[PDB]
Amino acid sequence: MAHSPPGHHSVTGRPSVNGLALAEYVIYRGEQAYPEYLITYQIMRPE
Amino acid sequence: GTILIDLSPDDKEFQSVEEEMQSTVREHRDGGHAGGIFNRYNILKIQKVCNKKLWERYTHRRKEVSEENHNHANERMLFHGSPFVNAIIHKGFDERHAYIGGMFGAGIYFAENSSKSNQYVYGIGGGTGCPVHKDRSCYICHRQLLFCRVTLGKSFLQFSA
Numbered sequence: 001m002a003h004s005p006p007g008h009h010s011v012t013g014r015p016s017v018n019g020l021a022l023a024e025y026v027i028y029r030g031e032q033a034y035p036e037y038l039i040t041y042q043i044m045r046p047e
Numbered sequence: 048g049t050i051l052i053d054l055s056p057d058d059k060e061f062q063s064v065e066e067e068m069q070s071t072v073r074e075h076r077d078g079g080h081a082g083g084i085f086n087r088y089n090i091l092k093i094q095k096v097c098n099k100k101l102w103e104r105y106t107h108r109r110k111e112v113s114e115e116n117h118n119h120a121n122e123r124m125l126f127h128g129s130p131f132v133n134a135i136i137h138k139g140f141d142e143r144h145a146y147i148g149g150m151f152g153a154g155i156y157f158a159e160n161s162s163k164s165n166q167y168v169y170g171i172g173g174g175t176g177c178p179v180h181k182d183r184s185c186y187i188c189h190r191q192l193l194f195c196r197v198t199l200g201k202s203f204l205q206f207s208a
């Protein structure tokens with residue numbers, strides 16, 4: 001696993017082309033996330 | 048140490064999690080190649096993941112970050128899709144769950160868009176799709192995503208295509 005940039009705890013990937021995309025994020029320590037909910041699902045075929 | 052508690056569909060907590068899942072679907076630039084073609088989900092089940100040791104591991108680190116960032120953990124609720132979901136809920140996130148080839152380096156990746164995380168349920172690029180039908184757009188097979196509590200602290204902003 002890489003290290004966070006110096007003086008930071010994570011990286012934010014801000015979308016810069018697709019105006020509808022939301023942000024994505026990266027942490028470099030497993031201890032910085034807790035898996036609160038497990039969601040079981042199917043994707044639905046558009047009508 | 049992990050137990051899974053089912054939420055009732057009548058529970059406000061089930062409903063707010065489902066709404067975050069459904070409302071953050073978008074179209075993807077791959078036309079559905081990785082994650083499939085869909086605008087919404089059929090939610091089958093939502094379970095609370097309970098593990099005291101893993102929770103205490105998280106809150107310990109959260110306090111460290113907060114103390115390094117003017118008492119602000121910058122905590123978010125984000126999606127994560129992975130073939131390693133079962134290991135994650137039992138043993139916690141660690142280096143084995145990292146996206147080694149990710150565009151921001153080898154770390155553990157999370158998305159605001161549930162449909163972005165859906166692209167990784169069967170592996171990077173959707174892998175070869177579901178185990179049973181080998182279909183990245185399978186409408187039959189049951190998928191699992193995690194909705195996770197994530198401490199961002201001071202986050203490095205990367206503008207990117």
Ligand SMILES: O=c1cc(-c2ccc(F)cc2)oc2ccccc12
Pocket residue numbers: 024025126127128129130144145146147156157158163164165167170171
């Ligand atoms: O949910 C994600 C999982 C992963 C992921 C990548 C590689 C793996 F081996 C496991 C999960 O990648 C992402 C990249 C961007 C946004 C969200 C994710």
Ligand SMILES: [Zn+2]
Pocket residue numbers: 177178179180181182185186187188
């Ligand atoms: Zn299938």
